[PDB]
Design a protein around this ligand. Structure first.
Ligand SMILES: [K+]
Lengths: 112, 103
């Protein structure tokens, strides 16, 4: 069952960790799509946003607040984009919930 | 394209969900808080439960709209994010293969 994020969480795969607390971990994407590209993940292994439930409300808000404070720390004041992919049509790579945060270039429209 | 009242997919005391009249996918809707948070970079700690509620509403509406094969949620901040309206919007896109990178 475990995805590659389990190695990031258990620190067996070195990552550039920007923030950690008991609920979440933030690290740089190693296949970046922007000059700044990091991932915010829960420690609870929710596989996808479609499988989050009411009990996850607080955690989901926490992930968004951590995303925006990390964006400020990474100097994304002129703007950035948050992306959550669900399933195959969403292009979800890894079946552990993650928020992409992209900045440092102009992001285009549509968003894929 | 003038919206109709049925373009509101969901409403409660916290939020509105409405179809995008300039859709980028066969299904494209917008989740906004009723609280006037202008951009995600201006959300604060007091907004934690609201932000989680918006995400839960997004995912339940995506079920309602038939997005079981997958979808994408997008929040734009500022000029580099391509933020078009200075109120918080969660875009939900589905019904086609979304590409990578996401813009
Ligand atoms: K926008």
């Amino acid at each position: 069952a475990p995805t590659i994020f389990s190695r990031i969480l258990d620190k067996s795969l070195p990552a550039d960790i920007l923030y950690e607390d008991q609920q979440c971990l933030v690290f740089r994407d190693v296949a970046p799509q922007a000059p700044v590209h990091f991932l915010v993940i829960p420690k609870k292994p929710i596989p996808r946003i479609s499988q989050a439930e009411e009990e996850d409300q607080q955690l989901l808000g926490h992930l968004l607040l951590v995303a925006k404070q990390t964006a400020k720390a990474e100097g994304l004041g002129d703007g950035y984009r948050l992306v959550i992919n669900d399933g195959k049509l969403g292009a979800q790579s890894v079946y552990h919930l993650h928020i992409h945060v992209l900045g440092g270039r102009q992001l285009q429209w549509p968003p894929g």
